[PDB]
Scaffold this active site. Structure first.
Site, PDB file in Angstrom:
ATOM      1  N   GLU A  59       0.701  -1.114   0.028  1.00 44.75           N
ATOM      2  CA  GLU A  59      -0.017   0.017   0.235  1.00 44.75           C
ATOM      3  C   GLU A  59       0.830   1.438  -0.102  1.00 44.75           C
ATOM      4  O   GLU A  59       0.563   2.147  -0.663  1.00 44.75           O
ATOM      5  CB  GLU A  59      -0.795   0.064   1.305  1.00 44.75           C
ATOM      6  N   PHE A 121     -11.805  -6.352  14.103  1.00 47.43           N
ATOM      7  CA  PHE A 121     -11.226  -6.974  13.243  1.00 47.43           C
ATOM      8  C   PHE A 121     -10.546  -6.022  12.184  1.00 47.43           C
ATOM      9  O   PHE A 121     -11.159  -5.512  11.414  1.00 47.43           O
ATOM     10  CB  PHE A 121     -11.723  -8.344  12.642  1.00 47.43           C
ATOM     11  N   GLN A 122      -9.291  -5.794  12.366  1.00 48.04           N
ATOM     12  CA  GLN A 122      -8.734  -4.829  11.489  1.00 48.04           C
ATOM     13  C   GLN A 122      -9.201  -3.270  11.398  1.00 48.04           C
ATOM     14  O   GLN A 122      -9.562  -2.849  10.439  1.00 48.04           O
ATOM     15  CB  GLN A 122      -8.624  -5.422   9.710  1.00 48.04           C
ATOM     16  N   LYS A 171     -17.812  -0.708   5.797  1.00 47.85           N
ATOM     17  CA  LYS A 171     -18.055  -1.751   4.973  1.00 47.85           C
ATOM     18  C   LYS A 171     -19.494  -1.655   4.579  1.00 47.85           C
ATOM     19  O   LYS A 171     -20.122  -2.042   3.570  1.00 47.85           O
ATOM     20  CB  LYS A 171     -17.563  -3.047   5.265  1.00 47.85           C
ATOM     21  N   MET A 485      23.967   9.484   2.088  1.00 51.32           N
ATOM     22  CA  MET A 485      23.794  10.718   2.829  1.00 51.32           C
ATOM     23  C   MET A 485      24.323  10.690   4.064  1.00 51.32           C
ATOM     24  O   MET A 485      24.958  11.810   4.762  1.00 51.32           O
ATOM     25  CB  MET A 485      22.564  11.321   2.519  1.00 51.32           C
TER      26      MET A 485
END
Ligand code: FAD
Ligand code: AUJ
Ligand code: A1AUL
Ligand code: MG
Length: 582
Positions: A59, A121-122, A171, A485
């Site tokens: 993602e 959940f999630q 959802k 760097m």
């Protein structure tokens, strides 16, 4: 006249309303990674014949791809993720888009509304998490709000100072049937009442007045000018003022132009920092006076009358107090000032040839330089060759580090939106996914990811996305086997004491580790490695001529240092011009 895939009186799922809301916004490409909470949205995407989904492998690669899509086109970038772990992976991209003012609309699935707060959940409070790293966010609580919120999300992301907007969709809202009302009015009364107005003539006349009274003027151009390349070029023709650009503003004014001072700031050219140091009029157009540019604020343009044009009133006077300020679109300010400069041209008699000659002396005494050790490939030289072989027409995305600076210093960008780089946040792993989004937005363009070995490996999984989507993404991997760097700062300020900056294998210390060629091989991407400077020109030419994706592993000596360098918080008299890690 938009054509819906549903009847005006036919109920449809909220997910289908959300996708149609994107179609009505002109969205052609999204970067969506499916999950439990966003599965209804992905089903609705397959029913769309106009929206293409580029499935990433992470993602973070999805949101970074949405950034490159946006940065290389001006259109808003759209990425979609599921709830919980999918949403939290977007965080680095959201903060990156906010700091660099990139238009972006992130859509995240969420647990059903009744489950919010129960640690389901999630479930993560992504709206609470992202409130301080987004321009605005939403939690859709009713299916009837989907058309309004999506319209507000795209309006906020693209208008004013662009930025990221997150829309969290539960959802159950995606599954609920409804008949959308596409004529809803937006509920942004405060934001719209504070939108900057077109600049007044009285403000513009006083700026042109200050230009004629000045003898050492300097243009301070930044990311706010990415849509004013023509208006800015006309302004420079009418005034002949040298142009100093920020990391974000590269390409607004052409780099290979006679009046270009190139980049200013911590790693800006000596003559660009010299010009701002001894200027009496500083035209700050589309900038935000970052500490990487100013150093010690009191010494930055200490003897200059500062004119600051910015579309965000919260930026005017934040770090450096200007003498004259204009809160509005710099595109319109340039248009209005160009009108005044044409009519009163002979009345003004603008000539800064004495100031330009004073700067051109510094430009020839202190130019950007690099050594060439034997047959070792100088990273600066490799970018120079890529410039020549692409005629400076390529879209360049970079990671973060030494390679990022050299890609800014040694590539002559002719137009804005060729330069895709994380400047405000400076997030490694930005290069490869941003090239993915830029290639999808510009299919007929040369897209090259000038990446470092540390940044490239962070999102190396996106090589699978490049192959599957058949994107002609070139990877010019400047490999120094180090976090270069941080290594450079170790050499300068910590007696070269290495503190976990070596990226190779200490057991096989002289072997190139990892073998980036096999990363490209795993994803069916043709790749090659070049070590000697003689073979570099043919190697880059092979990368460009080979159709499709290509990875070129360019081995560079790690002791190179980005120069010049004004130490953090320092002044112009503190600039470092010589030295490396040898
Ligand atoms: C390792 C590293 C080193 C760096 N060193 C340097 C360096 O030496 N030099 C350097 O310049 N940068 C450097 N940076 C980048 C940096 O930290 C900042 O991103 C950059 O300095 C600030 O860019 P900016 O001034 O153009 O403002 P931006 O981030 O580009 O924001 C645009 C500004 O213009 C305004 N604006 C936007 N749209 C409009 C409009 N339509 N009209 C008017 N105004 C508008 C916005 O309100 C905002 O204030 C470095 C980054 C990294 C990662
Ligand atoms: C997610 C992330 N983690 C750590 C970072 C802190 N930094 C850097 C910096 C400048 O942002 O520090 O201010 S640069 C850098 C190392 C660069 O590895 P390279 O890709 O090989 O590039 P090179 O050509 O070798 O130099 C680190 C570790 C960062 N920005 N992003
Ligand atoms: C290319 O930039 C880089 C790169 C690397 C690898 N390391 C540093 N090191 C510091 O930046 N040190 S720091 O001055 O204390 C500082 C740290 C963090 C934010 C601002 C800041 O400056 C504040 C003074 Cl105005 N800079
Ligand atoms: Mg490196």
């Amino acid at each position: 006249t938009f054509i819906s895939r549903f009847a005006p009186d036919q109920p449809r799922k909220g997910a289908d309303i959300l996708v149609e809301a994107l179609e009505r916004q002109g969205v052609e490409t999204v970067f969506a990674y499916p999950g439990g909470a966003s599965m209804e949205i992905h089903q609705a995407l397959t029913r769309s014949s106009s929206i293409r989904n580029v499935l990433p492998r992470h993602e973070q690669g999805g949101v970074f791809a949405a950034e490159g899509y946006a940065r290389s086109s001006g259109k808003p970038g759209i990425c979609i993720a599921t709830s919980g772990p999918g949403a939290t992976n977007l965080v680095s991209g959201l903060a990156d888009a906010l700091l660099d003012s990139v238009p972006l609309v992130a859509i995240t699935g969420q647990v059903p509304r009744r489950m919010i707060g129960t640690d389901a959940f999630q479930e993560t409070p992504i709206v609470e998490v992202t409130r301080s790293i987004t321009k605005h966010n939403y939690l859709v609580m009713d299916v009837e709000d989907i058309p309004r919120i999506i319209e507000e999300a795209f309006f906020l992301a693209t208008s004013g100072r662009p930025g990221p907007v997150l829309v969290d969709v539960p959802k159950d809202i995606q599954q609920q049937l409804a008949i959308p009302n596409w004529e809803q009015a937006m509920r942004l009364p405060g934001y719209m009442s504070r939108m900057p107005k077109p600049p007044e003539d009285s403000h513009l006349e006083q700026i042109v007045r200050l230009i004629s009274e000045s003898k050492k003027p300097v243009l301070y151009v930044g990311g706010g000018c990415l849509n004013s390349s023509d208006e800015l070029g006309r302004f420079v023709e009418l005034t002949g003022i040298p142009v100093a650009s920020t990391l974000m503003g590269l390409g607004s004014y052409p780099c290979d132009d006679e009046l270009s001072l190139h980049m200013l700031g911590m790693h800006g050219t000596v003559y660009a920092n010299y010009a701002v140091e001894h200027s009496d009029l500083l035209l700050a157009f589309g900038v935000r006076f970052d500490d990487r540019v100013t150093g010690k604020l009191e010494a930055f343009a200490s003897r200059a009358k500062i004119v600051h044009i910015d579309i965000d009133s919260a930026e005017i006077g934040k770090n450096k107090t200007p003498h004259v300020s204009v809160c509005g679109d710099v595109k319109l300010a340039l248009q209005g000032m160009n009108k005044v400069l044409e009519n009163r041209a002979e009345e003004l008699k603008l000539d800064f040839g004495v100031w330009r000659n004073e700067l051109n002396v510094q430009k020839q005494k202190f130019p950007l330089s690099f050594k060439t050790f034997g047959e070792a490939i100088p990273p600066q030289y490799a970018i120079k060759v890529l410039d020549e072989l692409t005629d400076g027409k390529a879209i360049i995305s970079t990671g973060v580090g030494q390679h990022q600076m050299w890609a800014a210093q040694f590539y002559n960008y002719k137009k804005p939106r060729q330069w895709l780089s994380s400047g405000g946040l400076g997030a490694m792993g930005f290069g490869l996914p941003a090239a993915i989004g830029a290639s999808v937005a510009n299919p007929d363009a040369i897209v090259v990811d000038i990446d470092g070995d540390g940044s490239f490996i962070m999102n190396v999984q996106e090589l699978a996305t490049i192959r599957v989507e058949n994107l002609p993404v070139k990877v010019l991997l400047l490999n120094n086997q180090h976090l270069g760097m941080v290594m450079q700062w170790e050499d300068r300020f910590y007696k070269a004491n290495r503190a976990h900056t070596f990226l190779g294998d200490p057991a096989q210390e002289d072997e190139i580790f990892p073998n980036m060629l096999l990363f490209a091989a795993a994803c069916g991407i043709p790749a090659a490695r070049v070590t000697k400077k003689a073979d570099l020109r043919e190697a880059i030419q092979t990368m460009l001529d080979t159709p499709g994706p290509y990875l070129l592993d360019v081995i560079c000596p790690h002791q190179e240092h980005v120069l010049p360098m004004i130490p953090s918080g320092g002044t112009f008299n503190d600039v470092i011009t010589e030295g490396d890690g040898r």
